[PDB]
């Protein structure tokens, strides 16, 4: 009952005994009363203020500690708390920051289907104001237009934090597609093509593609492996299945008998 | 919401999840299908003692999807929480599948009396006889006698006709059911030979229907024994009648 | 038969095609022919 | 399926020997077989209708046998008159 | 309730079961009368 | 009184009689069909229900004084209808209650006495024999009561009339259901009452109790038989979720719910619009536009219905998204003609590579684009304009340089011209190839269709489909 | 009268499934 409301959160959180004490704090709130009917009665709305506040700080702790399955877990606890039948409990300022963390995490999961189906609960909070939501929908607009340069010039532009765990997964989900787009029937290119298709002036990153994949830098020349097969000759695979398709016609030109 | 809670490993949080599972399962539909997959793998290791609610809401969601066997495998696996319920639109449909699963099993097992029978759960027959007692206490015994023939069980058939409800009438409703409509002859004699049981030890000699049933069977020596008893007890009134019915109905070799 | 919705309510031979109006750039063919010749 | 006319009669005449206990099916199956193309299937359907229903006033079999006695083929009229006499 | 609470316990097993036995016979009567009159078309051709 | 008072005696007497004989003969025709030959598939239950949608909503709109709609409740307050003399005693009363109301005045409604017009008609020795009679006579006051729109102690009279009728609906499906089957009537009554149960809430609040009750009615349905009951209760559960923000509950609903292939060409038009809206928003476009087409070309026998105006409205929006050029001037029909100015002006700037006009069209018509419900173009049309220009070049040209296309698309960067076409081939906008040597962007192979099985793949979709048209037409035609 | 009807609905079902069979079978041989 009112146990460690604001501990070591404003400055640092190096300890892990805070996590179990918050976990015991997550026990006692759910041992008090269930949030399932949720009709009225501002008394039980007081403990809905506290329960949503101790998970938003639990979400900030979860993104700080490099934890992916918990950051979706504490957000799903909060997003089910925003799903209220009789929605009340007036405006918390951490709400617009929280949806920006969820939507950018959903953009980082390579979820383009889930990205757009979330964008209905904000009526006019996408264009007029709310840069926390405006920054991913500007970013997703940049990926659809085709400007990779505009993506990374805005990578050093964040409203609140550094968005560090979000841009690095965003850095991960682009380059493998760029590696997926260059691994084709291409035979060889020089270093200046990887200066344009890829990026920086000889970092350890090109070693990472050299140690994991190929792209062996020899006499200032990369070597990407490539081949092709040949198949117009097989009339035999449309021989068996076409014979099935012709008979199932003639099976069905009769037989309602 | 509940998916987040079932990703952790305290039984005090398992109790608060299942309390929300069985409460709003009519609203929370197949969104929970990822969570039930975590219920099913964690069903193999029970660990804690609240596996009954886990098997309960597993049936609740498989009914909404339409799975009927797995709704019944977890209806039997539920236990006391499943048995105590008798007033729901949900509980009445799954026992109707259970009797349907039971009566297609016994007719399957009726074709093989010689070994190789399927193993029968005690919990499926725990609600068969429980519903039979509901059929007895309702005082509508036509409901009781209908399942008692579809179950291929004879002593529950004997128990109904031995009861002092409507002793000639309900028994004659039972004979009219078996004499008019019948397709299988394997249990036809078994129903026939248990009819002539109740005419013997009831109160009184009524030796017109037993001779009628033994014409329908092949008992030459068992008619001649009770015809000797009619002469021995100095009863030539109905004995003169019953030999004409034996002459008129049966023709030759009997 | 309402479907739970709302209603709001040559050039006229019920003709057109896909473009028919898309070009309007200088669209007189006396100039476009003439400008082409003098640039030679 | 079979092509000899005698076995086609003895097939459709066997309806009465198997369905005499329930008279509510013999008019349902003769009435569409008693309008076949050959006289033999029309013949054996007529005798099956008489031997199925022994002594019940049907008014449906009598409805079915009424055009059966009005046929140009001679022996299919014969089987109508016997089945009318049986019913 | 001797009959009220029991209407959904033992009698409901029959009344909710006969409806499938009622509608399929009602549905296949549309199907049975289809096949008969189709047979009456072709039998009228062969006789003529 | 001198001008309009002379036109007061002609409107009552003949429409009071001729409408009453129709619903009584059909109500008598519903009775004999309920009593015998319950196979009522082509019976007058449908056409009378086709009347109750059309005629009673466009003919009368008020409670029709001089005892036309107000007088039916004191007419029907005294009904038993159990035994053959008891019915004929009531059949004596049917003539007498019409003769007094036809000659003189009997009993008047003053917009407040609905409680004596709803309990005592339900009371006074009523039975459970004539259930569509009790169903229609309870649903017939539901139309003028809402259509009056007076709002003076009317919502609770609606609320009492709903909960009474919903209690009557439970008592039919559970108690004495033997050969009654009013589901063909009780579905649309459930649909029309929930429209009023939503709109009256929508004057003042949201609706949540209407859907928790709707989940229960679908739960106690879906086990018996699916004959348009589960169909109409599905869309009511789906229209509300599409009305609010959430799409996930509709997504799990549309996922696993099989269909009875029987909804009498009235729900098939509606449902194929809703699931086309759903597959649009989860970015499954090719399957969406064909079933958006399938609802539009289903029933064009409607005159300014708004629905045909709306399914046509979204269909041109999604065909812009595939770059499949929705018909550049064919969509001006005499039906709508006015709901195209925010869209004919839209597809003009989408076709060209102009943006300052396209920002002008979007900013001017942005209030329209939010009100109709298609403000999901704001993120999906900047992608379309930049891919339209590269699609037009790849369709026209065959071998273009990267420097030539970068200056053609007013981009001023020959270093991401390789990046645009790479996203074009990855997304499948055009099949091409980039030679990363000096700027060669070549086209495809020489087009041969008729020699590599391609006519067989188109024709095999046609043979198996049109014989299925034949097999469906054979299993519908014969009747007694 | 809740069990005596229930077997009668089966026998009307089983006869009708036979009566739909051979008429459907006869139409093949009547084309011959």
From Swiss-Prot, chain A:
Set out the biological process GO terms recorded for this chain's protein.
proteasome-mediated ubiquitin-dependent protein catabolic process
Cellular component terms per the entry's GO annotation? cytosol; nucleoplasm; nucleus; proteasome accessory complex; proteasome complex; proteasome regulatory particle; proteasome regulatory particle, lid subcomplex
Q: Please tell me which positions the record assigns to the cross-link Glycyl lysine isopeptide (Lys-Gly) (interchain with G-Cter in SUMO2).
A: 204
Ranges for the PCI domain? 69-238
Q: Would the keyword Glycoprotein be found if you checked this record's keyword annotation?
A: no
- Which top-level group of life is the source organism from? Eukaryota
Q: Which UniProt keywords apply?
A: Isopeptide bond, Phosphoprotein, Proteasome, Ubl conjugation
Its job? Component of the 26S proteasome, a multiprotein complex involved in the ATP-dependent degradation of ubiquitinated proteins. This complex plays a key role in the maintenance of protein homeostasis by removing misfolded or damaged proteins, which could impair cellular functions, and by removing proteins whose functions are no longer required. Therefore, the proteasome participates in numerous cellular processes, including cell cycle progression, apoptosis, or DNA damage repair.
For this chain, the family text in UniProt reads:
Belongs to the proteasome subunit S14 family.
Query: How does this chain assemble?
Result: Component of the 19S proteasome regulatory particle complex. The 26S proteasome consists of a 20S core particle (CP) and two 19S regulatory subunits (RP). The regulatory particle is made of a lid composed of 9 subunits including PSMD8, a base containing 6 ATPases and few additional components. Interacts with DDI2. Interacts with TASOR.
Its name, as the record gives it, is: 26S proteasome non-ATPase regulatory subunit 8
Q: Which residues of the full protein are shown?
A: 94 to 350 of 350
Curated annotation (Swiss-Prot), chain B:
State the species of origin.
Homo sapiens (Human)
Q: Which family does it belong to?
A: Belongs to the proteasome subunit S1 family.
Q: Relate the assembly described in the record.
A: Component of the 19S proteasome regulatory particle complex. The 26S proteasome consists of a 20S core particle (CP) and two 19S regulatory subunits (RP). The regulatory particle is made of a lid composed of 9 subunits, a base containing 6 ATPases and few additional components including PSMD1. Interacts with ADRM1. Interacts with ZFAND1.
What is the stated purpose of this protein? Answer: Component of the 26S proteasome, a multiprotein complex involved in the ATP-dependent degradation of ubiquitinated proteins. This complex plays a key role in the maintenance of protein homeostasis by removing misfolded or damaged proteins, which could impair cellular functions, and by removing proteins whose functions are no longer required. Therefore, the proteasome participates in numerous cellular processes, including cell cycle progression, apoptosis, or DNA damage repair.
This protein's name: 26S proteasome non-ATPase regulatory subunit 1
Swiss-Prot record, chain D:
Q: Where are the PC repeats?
A: 10-42, 44-78
Q: Which residues form a coiled coil?
A: none
Question: Highest taxon of the source?
Answer: Eukaryota
Assembly and partners? Component of the 19S proteasome regulatory particle complex. The 26S proteasome consists of a 20S core particle (CP) and two 19S regulatory subunits (RP). The regulatory particle is made of a lid composed of 9 subunits, a base containing 6 ATPases and few additional components including PSMD1. Interacts with ADRM1. Interacts with ZFAND1.
Chain's role: Component of the 26S proteasome, a multiprotein complex involved in the ATP-dependent degradation of ubiquitinated proteins. This complex plays a key role in the maintenance of protein homeostasis by removing misfolded or damaged proteins, which could impair cellular functions, and by removing proteins whose functions are no longer required. Therefore, the proteasome participates in numerous cellular processes, including cell cycle progression, apoptosis, or DNA damage repair.
What family is this protein classified in? Answer: Belongs to the proteasome subunit S1 family.
Identification of the protein by name: 26S proteasome non-ATPase regulatory subunit 1
Its source organism is Homo sapiens
The residues of the intact protein that this chain contains are 608 to 694 of 953
Curated annotation (Swiss-Prot), chain F:
Give the InterPro entries listed for this entry.
26S_Psome_reg_C (IPR013586), CSN3 (IPR050756), PCI_dom (IPR000717), TPR-like_helical_dom_sf (IPR011990), WH_DNA-bd_sf (IPR036390)
Superkingdom in the source lineage: Eukaryota
Signal peptide positions are none
Covalent link (Glycyl lysine isopeptide (Lys-Gly) (interchain with G-Cter in SUMO2)) residue numbers:
21
Q: Which UniProt keywords apply?
A: Isopeptide bond, Phosphoprotein, Proteasome, Ubl conjugation
Cite the PCI domain residue spans from the record: 269-448
| Region described as Disordered | 1-52
GO molecular function list: enzyme regulator activity
Q: Does the keyword Metal-binding apply?
A: no
Q: Where is the composition biased (Pro residues)?
A: 1-15
Q: Where on this protein does the Glycyl lysine isopeptide (Lys-Gly) (interchain with G-Cter in SUMO1) crosslink form?
A: 21
One GO biological-process annotation of the entry reads: ubiquitin-dependent protein catabolic process
GO CC, alphabetical = cytosol; extracellular exosome; extracellular region; ficolin-1-rich granule lumen; membrane; nucleoplasm; nucleus; proteasome accessory complex
Question: Residues where Phosphoserine occurs?
Answer: 401, 413
Oligomer and partners: Component of the 19S proteasome regulatory particle complex. The 26S proteasome consists of a 20S core particle (CP) and two 19S regulatory subunits (RP). The regulatory particle is made of a lid composed of 9 subunits including PSMD3, a base containing 6 ATPases and few additional components. Interacts with UBQLN1 (via ubiquitin-like domain). Interacts with ERCC6.
Q: Which PANTHER family match?
A: 26S PROTEASOME NON-ATPASE REGULATORY SUBUNIT 3, 26S PROTEASOME NON-ATPASE REGULATORY SUBUNIT 3/COP9 SIGNALOSOME COMPLEX SUBUNIT 3
Which family is this sequence assigned to? Belongs to the proteasome subunit S3 family.
Name listed for the protein in its UniProt record: 26S proteasome non-ATPase regulatory subunit 3
Protein source organism: Homo sapiens (Human)
